[PDB]
Amino acid sequence: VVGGEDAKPGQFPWQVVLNGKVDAFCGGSIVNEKWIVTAAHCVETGVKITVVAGEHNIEETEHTEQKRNVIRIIPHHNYNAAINKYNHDIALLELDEPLVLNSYVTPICIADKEYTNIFLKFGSGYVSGWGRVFHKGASALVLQYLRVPLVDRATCLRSTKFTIYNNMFCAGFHEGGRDSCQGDSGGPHVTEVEGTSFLTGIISWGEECAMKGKYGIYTKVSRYVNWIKEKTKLT
Amino acid sequence: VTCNIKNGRCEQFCKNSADNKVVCSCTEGYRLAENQKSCEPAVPFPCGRVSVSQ
Numbered sequence: 548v549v550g551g552e553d554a555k556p557g558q559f560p561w562q563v564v565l566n567g568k569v570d571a572f573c574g575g576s577i578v579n580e581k582w583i584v585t586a587a588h589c590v591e592t593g594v595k596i597t598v599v600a601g602e603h604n605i606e607e608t609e610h611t612e613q614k615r616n617v618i619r620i621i622p623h624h625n626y627n628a629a630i631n632k633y634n635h636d637i638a639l640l641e642l643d644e645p646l647v648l649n650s651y652v653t654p655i656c657i658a659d660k661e662y663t664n665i666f667l668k669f670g671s672g673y674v675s676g677w678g679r680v681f682h683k684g685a686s687a688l689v690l691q692y693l694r695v696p697l698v699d700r701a702t703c704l705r706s707t708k709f710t711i712y713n714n715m716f717c718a719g720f721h722e723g724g725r726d727s728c729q730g731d732s733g734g735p736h737v738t739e740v741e742g743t744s745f746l747t748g749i750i751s752w753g754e755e756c757a758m759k760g761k762y763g764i765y766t767k768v769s770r771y772v773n774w775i776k777e778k779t780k781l782t
Numbered sequence: 783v784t785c786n787i788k789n790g791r792c793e794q795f796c797k798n799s800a801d802n803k804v805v806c807s808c809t810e811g812y813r814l815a816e817n818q819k820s821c822e823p824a825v826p827f828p829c830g831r832v833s834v835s836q
């Protein structure tokens with residue numbers, strides 16, 4: 548996240564970090580004690596991924612971290628990296644052992660398709676992650692967050708030479724200086740509704756992070772809610 | 783009183799019901815409160831809530 552601020556411990560308790568050959572290569576959100584939702588491009592070539600919930604400072608041991616291994620990866624059935632790495636860019640991770648829910652490890656709420664879409668229409672969401680803090684710069688140590696406004700479709704299409712489909716949205720600032728960046732992909736875009744946060748997007752991709760005239764691209768979660776609820780149901 | 787106006791005063795979800803009334807509801811882990819609008823936690827760590835002191 549470029550132009551964000553340090554989160555306080557427990558401020559985004561649904562946030563997870565994905566670690567592999569490099570740390571904090573992507574983010575994720577807690578659906579429930581056994582399931583994480585992330586971007587499919589983060590987990591396509593299934594290397595040994597470690598999920599860390601309750602994380603704050605990725606370089607310090609702070610006692611709230613819960614590390615888990617991934618036993619199953621479910622990309623969306625329409626995901627096909629040979630066609631486009633970034634279309635239908637959503638996946639579910641099944642954890643080896645359930646997380647222990649507490650004030651630092653709490654799921655994100657997921658509304659039905661209709662309300663997920665209404666919440667996105669509020670026009671302002673929070674994104675968070677350990678991604679780069681400048682374009683081509685270092686990864687964050689402390690979790691970063693930023694409030695991002697929804698950007699209209701036409702503006703979004705004019706901003707990039709790549710195609711943006713209706714299951715994706717743009718968010719950011721016309722002036723630059725504030726945006727998601729590499730390493731944040733897979734993390735949450737959430738909308739606060741009277742003090743309760745709902746998952747409204749998945750951080751997907753971007754080009755020159757925070758450059759004026761560029762915007763972060765996100766997966767619209769409303770399109771995938773029924774699939775998430777069915778696949779992650781514990782009963 | 784409809785779900786189109788201020789979400790029927792429902793804190794989370796709203797459904798239009800008989801005789802120009804609405805029925806509010808909440809996500810998993812919350813209970814609809816006695817005031818018929820608010821959502822109260824019904825589990826120790828309900829989703830989407832910040833419980834650590836900020």
Ligand SMILES: Cc1ccc2c(c1)c(-c1nnn[nH]1)c1n2C[C@@](NC(=O)c2ccc(-n3cnnc3)cc2Cl)(c2ccccc2)CC1
Pocket residue numbers: 588633709710727728729730731732750751752753754755756763
């Ligand atoms: C949120 C966010 C934000 C920014 C992110 C990313 C994520 C990622 C990224 N995420 N995961 N893997 N790479 C990158 N970046 C910046 C980076 N982006 C790309 O190379 C890139 C280019 C094209 C496309 N694309 C093509 N068709 N649809 C999408 C996607 C990316 Cl990620 C780049 C672009 C120009 C110059 C330097 C670098 C490199 C990779």
Ligand code: NA
Pocket residue numbers: 602603604605606607608609612
């Ligand atoms: Na830590």
